[PDB]
Scaffold this motif. Structure first.
Motif, PDB file in Angstrom:
ATOM      1  N   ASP A  19       0.853  -1.179   0.000  1.00 52.78           N
ATOM      2  CA  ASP A  19       0.000   0.000   0.000  1.00 52.78           C
ATOM      3  C   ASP A  19       0.894   1.236   0.000  1.00 52.78           C
ATOM      4  OD1 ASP A  19      -1.734   2.119   0.693  1.00 52.78           O
ATOM      5  OD2 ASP A  19      -2.743   0.964   2.263  1.00 52.78           O
ATOM      6  N   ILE A  20       0.729   2.103  -0.999  1.00 55.52           N
ATOM      7  CA  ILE A  20       1.563   3.295  -1.092  1.00 55.52           C
ATOM      8  C   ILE A  20       1.464   4.153   0.166  1.00 55.52           C
ATOM      9  CG2 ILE A  20      -0.120   4.816  -2.272  1.00 55.52           C
ATOM     10  CD1 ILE A  20       2.206   5.723  -4.094  1.00 55.52           C
ATOM     11  N   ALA A  35      -1.913   9.519  -8.213  1.00 49.41           N
ATOM     12  CA  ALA A  35      -2.599   9.303  -9.496  1.00 49.41           C
ATOM     13  C   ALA A  35      -3.887  10.129  -9.462  1.00 49.41           C
ATOM     14  CB  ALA A  35      -2.864   7.824  -9.706  1.00 49.41           C
ATOM     15  N   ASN A  37      -6.872  13.172 -10.748  1.00 50.63           N
ATOM     16  CA  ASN A  37      -7.646  13.738 -11.840  1.00 50.63           C
ATOM     17  C   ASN A  37      -7.357  15.237 -11.955  1.00 50.63           C
ATOM     18  OD1 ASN A  37      -9.767  15.230 -10.202  1.00 50.63           O
ATOM     19  ND2 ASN A  37     -10.190  13.121  -9.547  1.00 50.63           N
ATOM     20  N   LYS A  41      -9.676  16.153  -7.189  1.00 51.90           N
ATOM     21  CA  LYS A  41     -10.735  15.669  -6.303  1.00 51.90           C
ATOM     22  C   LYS A  41     -10.392  14.233  -5.929  1.00 51.90           C
ATOM     23  CE  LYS A  41     -13.459  19.178  -5.662  1.00 51.90           C
ATOM     24  NZ  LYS A  41     -12.555  20.170  -4.985  1.00 51.90           N
ATOM     25  N   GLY A  44     -10.950   8.263  -4.504  1.00 50.69           N
ATOM     26  CA  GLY A  44     -10.729   6.845  -4.285  1.00 50.69           C
ATOM     27  C   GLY A  44      -9.342   6.415  -4.717  1.00 50.69           C
ATOM     28  N   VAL A  46      -5.563   5.470  -5.067  1.00 49.20           N
ATOM     29  CA  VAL A  46      -4.396   6.078  -4.449  1.00 49.20           C
ATOM     30  C   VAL A  46      -4.750   7.440  -3.856  1.00 49.20           C
ATOM     31  CG1 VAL A  46      -2.124   7.049  -4.948  1.00 49.20           C
ATOM     32  CG2 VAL A  46      -2.775   4.796  -5.861  1.00 49.20           C
ATOM     33  N   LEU A 123       1.093   2.899 -10.216  1.00 51.16           N
ATOM     34  CA  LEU A 123       0.917   2.721 -11.658  1.00 51.16           C
ATOM     35  C   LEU A 123      -0.229   3.602 -12.154  1.00 51.16           C
ATOM     36  CD1 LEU A 123       1.390  -1.076 -12.116  1.00 51.16           C
ATOM     37  CD2 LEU A 123       2.959   0.745 -12.835  1.00 51.16           C
ATOM     38  N   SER A 125      -3.042   5.475 -14.171  1.00 45.66           N
ATOM     39  CA  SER A 125      -4.126   5.089 -15.069  1.00 45.66           C
ATOM     40  C   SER A 125      -4.546   3.633 -14.962  1.00 45.66           C
ATOM     41  CB  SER A 125      -3.887   5.468 -16.536  1.00 45.66           C
ATOM     42  OG  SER A 125      -3.805   6.866 -16.697  1.00 45.66           O
ATOM     43  N   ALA A 126      -3.898   2.822 -14.118  1.00 45.99           N
ATOM     44  CA  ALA A 126      -4.132   1.382 -14.137  1.00 45.99           C
ATOM     45  C   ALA A 126      -5.324   0.931 -13.301  1.00 45.99           C
ATOM     46  CB  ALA A 126      -2.876   0.671 -13.639  1.00 45.99           C
ATOM     47  N   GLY A 127      -5.949   1.846 -12.582  1.00 45.77           N
ATOM     48  CA  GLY A 127      -7.072   1.536 -11.728  1.00 45.77           C
ATOM     49  C   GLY A 127      -8.366   1.965 -12.376  1.00 45.77           C
ATOM     50  N   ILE A 128      -9.033   2.931 -11.750  1.00 47.92           N
ATOM     51  CA  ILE A 128     -10.335   3.380 -12.214  1.00 47.92           C
ATOM     52  C   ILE A 128     -10.261   4.048 -13.591  1.00 47.92           C
ATOM     53  CG2 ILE A 128     -10.462   5.657 -11.136  1.00 47.92           C
ATOM     54  CD1 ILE A 128     -13.280   4.891 -10.167  1.00 47.92           C
ATOM     55  N   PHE A 129      -9.079   4.519 -14.024  1.00 47.39           N
ATOM     56  CA  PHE A 129      -8.934   5.137 -15.332  1.00 47.39           C
ATOM     57  C   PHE A 129      -8.820   4.117 -16.465  1.00 47.39           C
ATOM     58  CE2 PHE A 129      -7.324   9.775 -14.441  1.00 47.39           C
ATOM     59  CZ  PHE A 129      -8.550  10.122 -13.941  1.00 47.39           C
ATOM     60  N   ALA A 151       4.721   1.072  -5.809  1.00 45.75           N
ATOM     61  CA  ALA A 151       3.938   0.345  -4.822  1.00 45.75           C
ATOM     62  C   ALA A 151       2.649  -0.127  -5.490  1.00 45.75           C
ATOM     63  CB  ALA A 151       3.620   1.226  -3.620  1.00 45.75           C
ATOM     64  N   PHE A 153      -0.669  -2.136  -4.786  1.00 43.35           N
ATOM     65  CA  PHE A 153      -1.516  -2.588  -3.685  1.00 43.35           C
ATOM     66  C   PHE A 153      -1.986  -4.024  -3.869  1.00 43.35           C
ATOM     67  CE2 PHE A 153      -4.467  -1.448  -0.252  1.00 43.35           C
ATOM     68  CZ  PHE A 153      -5.560  -2.229  -0.453  1.00 43.35           C
TER      69      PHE A 153
HETATM   70  N1  LIG Z   1      -3.327   2.474  -1.659  1.00 39.99           N
HETATM   71  C1  LIG Z   1      -2.778   2.031  -2.853  1.00 39.99           C
HETATM   72  N2  LIG Z   1      -1.482   1.759  -2.901  1.00 39.99           N
HETATM   73  C2  LIG Z   1      -0.935   1.360  -4.057  1.00 39.99           C
HETATM   74  N3  LIG Z   1      -1.568   1.147  -5.212  1.00 39.99           N
HETATM   75  C3  LIG Z   1      -2.880   1.404  -5.138  1.00 39.99           C
HETATM   76  C4  LIG Z   1      -3.555   1.854  -4.007  1.00 39.99           C
HETATM   77  N4  LIG Z   1      -4.885   2.024  -4.313  1.00 39.99           N
HETATM   78  C5  LIG Z   1      -4.991   1.695  -5.598  1.00 39.99           C
HETATM   79  N5  LIG Z   1      -3.807   1.299  -6.118  1.00 39.99           N
HETATM   80  C6  LIG Z   1      -3.493   0.871  -7.480  1.00 39.99           C
HETATM   81  O1  LIG Z   1      -2.939   2.060  -8.170  1.00 39.99           O
HETATM   82  C7  LIG Z   1      -3.226   1.953  -9.516  1.00 39.99           C
HETATM   83  C8  LIG Z   1      -3.928   3.239  -9.977  1.00 39.99           C
HETATM   84  O2  LIG Z   1      -5.283   3.194  -9.559  1.00 39.99           O
HETATM   85  P1  LIG Z   1      -6.111   4.524  -9.224  1.00 39.99           P
HETATM   86  O3  LIG Z   1      -5.709   5.069  -7.900  1.00 39.99           O
HETATM   87  O4  LIG Z   1      -7.543   4.153  -9.429  1.00 39.99           O
HETATM   88  O5  LIG Z   1      -5.568   5.574 -10.303  1.00 39.99           O
HETATM   89  P2  LIG Z   1      -5.956   5.885 -11.845  1.00 39.99           P
HETATM   90  O6  LIG Z   1      -4.825   6.691 -12.369  1.00 39.99           O
HETATM   91  O7  LIG Z   1      -6.347   4.634 -12.548  1.00 39.99           O
HETATM   92  O8  LIG Z   1      -7.272   6.761 -11.714  1.00 39.99           O
HETATM   93  C9  LIG Z   1      -7.186   8.090 -11.187  1.00 39.99           C
HETATM   94  C10 LIG Z   1      -8.404   8.331 -10.344  1.00 39.99           C
HETATM   95  O9  LIG Z   1      -8.291   7.543  -9.220  1.00 39.99           O
HETATM   96  C11 LIG Z   1      -8.732   8.316  -8.051  1.00 39.99           C
HETATM   97  O10 LIG Z   1     -10.033   8.145  -7.858  1.00 39.99           O
HETATM   98  C12 LIG Z   1      -8.291   9.751  -8.512  1.00 39.99           C
HETATM   99  O11 LIG Z   1      -8.910  10.748  -7.648  1.00 39.99           O
HETATM  100  C13 LIG Z   1      -8.524   9.824  -9.854  1.00 39.99           C
HETATM  101  O12 LIG Z   1      -9.848  10.367 -10.205  1.00 39.99           O
HETATM  102  C14 LIG Z   1      -4.068   0.665  -9.736  1.00 39.99           C
HETATM  103  O13 LIG Z   1      -3.232  -0.358 -10.215  1.00 39.99           O
HETATM  104  C15 LIG Z   1      -4.557   0.395  -8.296  1.00 39.99           C
HETATM  105  O14 LIG Z   1      -4.759  -0.997  -8.002  1.00 39.99           O
END
Ligand SMILES: Nc1ncnc2c1ncn2[C@@H]1O[C@H](COP(=O)(O)OP(=O)(O)OC[C@H]2O[C@H](O)[C@H](O)[C@@H]2O)[C@@H](O)[C@H]1O
Length: 166
Positions: A19-20, A35, A37, A41, A44, A46, A123, A125-129, A151, A153
């Protein structure tokens, strides 16, 4: 440096299943990457987790940043405080591929890391993006020249990434 337990990927890129927020709390690095927007805002993932760990100070600071300067660019960044987690937080906006933004901007996003000698980062963009995580890792490796400690998660994701070609 006090980064411990990282797997080496390349000369300059390291990775760990962690966890970062916990890494930042333990290491107190000069720079933690968010990571973000474009509106900063921090809802969720990171961003939401980092902000929660600052007891919302990151969001309060970010709201003033936006009121003064307006939204970031996709692929852009700003340096703000790291609060109780790090000296600085580099907020970086990867493309929101799920909303039609160009995946090519992920390279522009990672270029911001080259302005800092050492970073703890996720990483982008690798999550919700919605970018493919292995693609984000490859762009990181092929773009960032400074020392990056990634890092990851999610255990399942980590195990897949470290078993993939770069
Ligand atoms: N605590 C953590 N520690 C390390 N990695 C994590 C953690 N939480 C998630 N990841 C991973 O980190 C990576 C990125 O996931 P994301 O955080 O969604 O970032 P994005 O760039 O895709 O989306 C940006 C939006 O996310 C937010 O809502 C912002 O406010 C933005 O609106 C994935 O592999 C996750 O599994």
């Amino acid at each position: 440096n006090s980064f411990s337990g990282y797997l080496k990927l390349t000369d300059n890129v390291y990775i760990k299943n962690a966890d970062i927020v916990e890494e930042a709390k333990k290491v107190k690095p000069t720079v933690v990457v968010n990571a973000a927007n474009v509106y900063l805002k921090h809802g969720g993932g990171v961003a939401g987790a980092l902000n929660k760990a600052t007891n919302n100070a990151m969001q309060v600071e970010s709201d003033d940043y936006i009121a003064t300067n307006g939204p970031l660019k996709v692929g852009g960044s700003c340096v703000l405080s790291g609060h109780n987690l790090a000296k600085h937080c580099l907020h970086v906006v990867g493309p929101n591929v799920n909303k039609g933004e160009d995946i090519q901007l992920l390279k522009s996003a990672y270029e911001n890391f080259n302005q800092h000698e050492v970073l703890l980062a996720p990483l982008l963009s690798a999550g919700i993006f919605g970018a493919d995580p292995i693609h984000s890792l490859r762009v990181c490796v092929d773009t960032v020249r400074t020392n990056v400690y990634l890092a990851v998660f999610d255990k399942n994701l980590y195990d897949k990434l470290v078993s993939s070609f770069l």
